[PDB]
């Protein structure tokens, strides 16, 4: 095809439960597409890397805000994230290790950053890395 | 979320007709997941860039083969790709321009490369660039 669909290419290791469902994927696309209506993509013929990076940030924040991830003080809902991991029903030994890294990643994020957006950015990066390590997940880049 | 779904972030410009449906997206995931059961991701502790690149090429080949995109000799079905563009029902001026590029991308691919896989790789990159330009499509990297 001249227009192939692009999908993630991931081996889930010990953690097949973390693979998004078709439904979860369709949900997220709807959120992102709505965010893009207000946050159009920068012109790649003209945009600077900084403009691209800050626009990307704005879309990630939009999707988290639209789906309820910040409280009335603007703080990311770390306890919601924890409960969502428990709801995946990982194998018990993996769950325990992931939930310990949740605490470690929340601590790292909150001690490094006072900015609530920087906190969630570092927490998500921290969990992407640590979940990948615990689970043996490989992602094609 | 500690495990957000990752989705394309694209503005489709003049060419919303090219956005994959949920069905098309789900089929491509099913094909890629089946391809990975035989074409495992290389271990980044050990993998060369050549091994990583050749593995990525194999997944693309695998998914194209699963969907019927090669004849029995191994040649990519360029005329199928051409007819699939016409069946998108783009605006007439857009279609005209995209089909001129299809023919020119095919001719470049076959003149530059004798390897059938190299031919489809060049054609798809050529069409990604040219369809994006004609349509005004922006894709977040
Ligand atoms: Na915990």
Author numbering:
A (entry chain A), B (entry chain B): 7 to 147
Excerpt from the paper describing this PDB structure:
In this work, we have explored the structure and function of such non-insect OBPs in the mite Varroa destructor, a major pest of honey bee. Mass spectrometric analysis demonstrated that the six cysteines VdesOBPs, whose sequence position do not match the pattern in insect OBPs, are paired into three disulphide bridges (C1–C6, C2–C3 and C4–C5) different from that (C1–C3, C2–C5, C4–C6) of their insect counterparts. The overall folding, determined for VdesOBP1, is also novel and different from the conserved structure of insect OBPs, although some similar aspects can be recognised. Comparison with classical OBPs reveals that the second of the six α-helices found in them is lacking in VdesOBP1.
Another crystal form was collected, with space group P21 at 1.2 Å resolution, and its structure was determined by molecular replacement using the P3221 crystal form. VdesOBP1 crystal forms P3221 and P21 were crystallized at pH values of 7.5 and 9.5, respectively. They contain one and two molecules in the asymmetric unit, respectively. The chain was built in the electron density map of the P21 crystal form with the exception of residues 1–6 at the N-terminus, while the P3221 crystal form starts at residue 11 and lacks loop 50–53. In contrast, the P21 form contains two molecules in the asymmetric unit forming a crystallographic dimer. Finally, the PISA server reported an ambiguous response for the P21 form (score = 0.49) but discarded the possibility of a biological dimer in form P3221 (score = 0). The active site is empty, except in form P21 where a buffer molecule, 2-(N-cyclohexylamino)-ethane sulfonic acid (NCES), is docked against a wall of the binding site. Examination of the binding site in the crystallographic dimer revealed that the N-terminus of each monomer protrudes deeply in the binding site of the other monomer, drastically reducing its size. This effect explains the serendipitous binding of NCES as this ligand interacts with the cell wall of one monomer and the C-terminal extension of the other one.
